[PDB]
């Protein structure tokens, strides 16, 4: 039921400058004019925020250039939009955006927000299809243009809407909406702010903190996300294709969070009025070291410089007696089963790797200790016992067995530590 919408656009996305945006209250603890430093996931100051042009219209006969990509979700995102219309609905978050993995869906319509964690079957170009009544009142909004099926549905939440229009807006002003999403320790936290600005090409120069909206208890693995856009049905064509849906203009700003240290200056009412990001530049590191916004002339010790070391060179001595096992594992005549042999291997250099990987052994079981960690341990004595048995009697050489061999020929204690090795020898020991 879903549509191919994506037209290939040669133009790359632009880049703007997040001057000082995307700061939030990282906790519920009233403060009053206390300069507080906090290490958390924040958007860095003067960073490189990508300006995505979604649906955009050029006038020749009317051409929309749909391009709405799936973006990574590294550690949380900062999302921003100056949209007069209602073209930005919620988002989809997930790992595969397919079946066999759970996904999260946030949808805002005109009176509620609905949030579902479920097992969706999203299409290649998901959107929200809106229908009207010729008096421009709403008729229905089909979510089956987003997904084709939605089963095994775990979480559902519904409340007052996240984003509202507020058109009019005092004449000529624009409404910037900012959101911060982060998914940590099984919780999904959303922060939001709405701010009025005038006709600027970019993000403004001021300062505005972000109050938290919701902390959804999900436990979802998120690595990718995508934005939902609303398209209206055209009614001037019977088909469902890309010519059958009309759209306005949509654009947004996406930046990524990073773990930084921020010095926040609170107000007496409990309002973050300004802040600064430590690191970044030196001056700021001094302000953070002093816990102030004005440093007086002087000289200040601010941190330390420590060269970094690469690679780890492990020196050692050569090797001589690498154990000639090639006497017990390479004998011309073995020993009976009722009088087994007993060699007491002693001080040397044992290389159980030449054994473990020789692939000539039909049975190599290790009991006290898994095989790969033998060439990394040291003991007092190794004993090696040798004998010859039938083929199907090799299962009685193990701790805690019974049978004519383990009963009275050769018994292994019940807390054995070594390993048992066995290989077929039909051509050497059997004679016509």
């Amino acid at each position: 039921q879903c549509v191919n919408l994506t037209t290939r656009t040669q133009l790359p996305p632009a880049y703007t400058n997040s001057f000082t945006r995307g700061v939030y209250y990282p906790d519920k603890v009233f403060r009053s004019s206390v300069l507080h430093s906090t290490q958390d996931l924040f958007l860095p100051f003067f960073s490189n925020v990508t300006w995505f042009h979604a649906i955009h219209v050029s006038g020749t006969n009317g051409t929309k250039r749909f391009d709405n990509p799936v973006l990574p979700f590294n550690d949380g995102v900062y999302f921003a939009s100056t949209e007069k219309s209602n073209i930005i609905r919620g988002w989809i978050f997930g790992t595969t955006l397919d079946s066999k993995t759970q996904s999260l869906l946030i949808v805002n319509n005109a009176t509620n927000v609905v949030i579902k964690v479920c097992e969706f079957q999203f299409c290649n170009d998901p959107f929200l299809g809106v229908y009207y009544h010729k008096n421009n009142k709403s008729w229905m909004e089909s979510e089956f243009r987003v997904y084709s099926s939605a089963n095994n549905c775990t979480f559902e939440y519904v409340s007052q809407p996240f984003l509202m229009d507020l058109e009019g807006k005092q004449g000529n002003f624009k409404n910037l909406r900012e959101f911060v999403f982060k998914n940590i320790d099984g919780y999904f936290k959303i922060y939001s702010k709405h701010t009025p600005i005038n006709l600027v090409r970019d993000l403004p120069q001021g300062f505005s903190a972000l109050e938290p909206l919701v902390d959804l208890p999900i436990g979802i693995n998120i690595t990718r996300f995508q934005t939902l856009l609303a398209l209206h049905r055209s009614y001037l064509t019977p088909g469902d294709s890309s010519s059958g849906w009309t759209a306005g203009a949509a654009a947004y700003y996406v930046g990524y969070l990073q773990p930084r240290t921020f010095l926040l200056k609170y107000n007496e009412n409990g309002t973050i009025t300004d802040a600064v990001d430590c690191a970044l530049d030196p001056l700021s590191e001094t302000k953070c070291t002093l816990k102030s916004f004005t440093v007086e002339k002087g000289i200040y010790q601010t941190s330390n410089f420590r060269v970094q070391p690469t690679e780890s060179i492990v020196r050692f001595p050569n090797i001589t007696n690498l154990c000639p096992f090639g006497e017990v594992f390479n004998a011309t005549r073995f020993a009976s089963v009722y009088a087994w042999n007993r060699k007491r291997i002693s001080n040397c250099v044992a290389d159980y790797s030449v054994l473990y990987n020789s692939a000539s052994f039909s049975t190599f079981k290790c009991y006290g200790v898994s095989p790969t960690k033998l060439n990394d341990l040291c003991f007092t004595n190794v004993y090696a016992d040798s004998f010859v048995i039938r083929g199907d009697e090799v299962r009685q050489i193990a701790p805690g067995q019974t049978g004519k061999i383990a009963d009275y020929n050769y018994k292994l204690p019940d807390d054995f530590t070594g390993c048992v090795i066995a290989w077929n020898s039909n051509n050497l020991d059997s004679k016509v």
Partner: antibody
Amino acid sequence: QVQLQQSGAEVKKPGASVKVSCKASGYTFSRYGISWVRQAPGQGLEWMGWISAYKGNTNYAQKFQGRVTMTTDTSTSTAYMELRSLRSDDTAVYYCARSPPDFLGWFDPWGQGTLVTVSS
Amino acid sequence: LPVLTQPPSVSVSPGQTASITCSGDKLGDKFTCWYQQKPGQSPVQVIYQDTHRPSGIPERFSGSNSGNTATLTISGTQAVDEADYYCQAWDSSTVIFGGGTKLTVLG
């Protein structure tokens, strides 16, 4: 280029049931809908109902509610309409039009129509 | 039912403009289509959504819809524009067809 071929000139008795078929060719049948329109001889058009070819999704008029059943078959790409409990007053010409998959308009190509005559 | 009332016959001499009026109640919140059916054939859509005309229909059919009446207008009526003309109104729930209107090029 698009094409809707109907079938039959059936003659029934009062009380029987009739099934009319309409086969499409020239376009993707799975992404549209079929609506049925009646016309009594010498009278105006009547709307019977509509089906979407994606997944069932009928819509009947209240005059024919409980009497008509419309089905599709996208493997052979035909549409069927079955009327039950026929009587005189139902002898007419039945038309098959290609409507959109939603929003219930656009009776564009109009397959040639079958005359169903009841009586005895 | 908002049932559309439409006059049964409109007579026009060859070379004038014909005006067919489909008047029903409300009809301002509904889209109206106009269909043409020649005698002995299947109907042909000539106006779909309130003054919109498909390709292949010549540049003399013009629709209109304002208030409680819809109007089809043919300018320069030839002898080939002699058929029945039906008015149709749809909304989110149902579809209503009007009565006929036999147009005649007074010969």
